[PDB]
Amino acid sequence: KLEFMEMEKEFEQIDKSGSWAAIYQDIRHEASDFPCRVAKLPKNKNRNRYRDVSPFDHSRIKLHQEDNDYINASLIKMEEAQRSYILTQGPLPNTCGHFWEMVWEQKSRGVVMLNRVMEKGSLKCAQYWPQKEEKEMIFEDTNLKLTLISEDIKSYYTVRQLELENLTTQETREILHFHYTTWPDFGVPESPASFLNFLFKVRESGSLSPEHGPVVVHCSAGIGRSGTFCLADTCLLLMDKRKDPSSVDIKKVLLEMRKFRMGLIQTADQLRFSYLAVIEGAKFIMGDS
């Protein structure tokens, strides 16, 4: 039971010997490399937010439109944890229709956003959901209508209830939007407690349930913060599932996730944070209060 003490120790040992940089560099070296031919096609250039961040061909989400099926989004499938996630970039001004089309086609019920909206330079993201109930959004290219139904705003995150309507069939669905608002570019969450609270709220909602399509997770590039978020959730799952939570190899789980999308987790501090968050999360879950 109190074996979590050994975990905290091993963590302190990595901290003390300054090995976060070593583990993270080894991950970068060992990380899978696969082709991204579709992402690089000339016609897809304006569908990519960043020159060097591309989805691998084998795991990319395809849009069900005969024209151009390309979206910068990847399906991460974690077999043992039995969870799936779609990681994508902050939508661009011309890919908001594609983003919601993917949300529709894949049957996701939740969207997790970890960045903030479109600055007046770089490292931005278009305003892809309505800010007011009466100002709904219609994506003509993909024939979808998006309406803001309600919004619960908190200190570090906001949860929104949206209605997504396929204008062709007039069928409508409820999408939950979980927006963590205080996670800086290449930074870490305010604290493990805040992150964990956010994560638990996403879990509690059922958006991560195998009954729905996979949750769509995004930040700006769809790799640093998105990678930190999913890595933490998946490691928590494995620790609860398995008999020995100490047997969970975070580094290894991250390398596994990297087979599906490049660059997941962008700094050694984010790697460290994911370890902290998982250890803390495992205590609260394997706890009683």
Active site (catalytic) residues:
219
Q: Find out whether 144 and 138 touch, Cβ atoms under 8 Å.
A: yes
223: annotated binding-site residue? yes
Count the alpha carbons within 13 Å of 77 in the hemisphere toward its beta carbon.
7
Using an 8 Å Cβ cutoff, are 175 and 108 in contact?
Answer: yes
Residue 58 contacts Mg ion per CB under 5 A: yes
Dmax (CA) for the chain in angstroms is 60
Range in contact with ligand P90 (rule: CB under 6 A) among 127-135, 158-166, 189-197, 260-268: 260-268
Judged by CB under 5 A, which of 14, 126, 263, 267 binds Cl ion? Answer: 263
Instruction: Report H helices in 41-89.
Output: none
Q: In the beta sheet, which residues pair with residue 161?
A: 150, 176
- Say whether residue 222 binds ligand P90 (CB under 6 A): yes
Is 34 one of the binding residues for ligand P90 (CB under 6 A)?
Answer: no
Q: Which residue is nearest to ligand P90 (CB)?
A: 224
Spatial distance between the Cα atoms of 274 and 160, rounded to a whole number of angstroms:
25
Q: Angle CA(162)–CA(223)–CA(42) in degrees, nearest 5?
A: 90
User: Does 264 sit near ligand P90 (CB under 6 A)?
Assistant: no
Among 122, 155, 168, 170, binds ligand P90 (CB under 6 A): 122
Mapping DSSP to helix (H, G, I), strand (E, B) and coil, where does residue 72 land?
A: strand
Of residues 221, 248, 253, 268, which one binds ligand P90 by CB under 6 A? Answer: 221
Q: What CA dihedral angle connects 26, 28, 34 and 37, to 10 degrees?
A: -170
Q: Which residues contact 277 (CB under 8 A, 6 or more apart)?
A: 189, 192, 195, 196, 232
CA atoms of 244 and 241, how far apart (whole Å) = 9
Provide the minimum distance between the beta carbon of 226 and ligand P90 in the complex, in angstroms, as a whole number: 6
- The span from the CA of 63 to the CA of 244, in Å, is 40
Ligand-binding annotation for 268, yes or no, is no
- Smaller CB separation from ligand P90, 207 or 226: 226
The least distance separating ligand P90 from the CB of residue 282, rounded to whole angstroms, comes to 24
Residue 52 interacting partner from Mg ion, Cl ion, ligand P90, none (CB closer than 5 to 8 Å by kind): ligand P90
User: 63, 75, 223, 282: which one contacts ligand P90 (CB under 6 A)?
Assistant: 223
* C-beta separation of 170 from 163 below 8 A: no
Number of residues near Cl ion (by CB under 5 A): 2
Is 23 assigned to a binding site? no
When asked if residue 185 is in the footprint of ligand P90 (CB under 6 A), the reply is yes
53 is a site residue for ligand P90 (CB under 6 A): yes
H-run or E-run covering 257? helix 250-258
- The least distance separating Mg ion from the CB of residue 147, rounded to whole angstroms, comes to 7
Binding site for Mg ion (CB under 5 A): 58
**Would you tell me which residues interact with Cl ion (CB under 5 A)?**
28, 263
Interface residues with ligand P90 (CB under 6 A) are 50-53, 115, 122-123, 185-186, 219-226, 262-263, 266
Question: Residues annotated as binding site for substrate?
Answer: 185, 219-225, 266
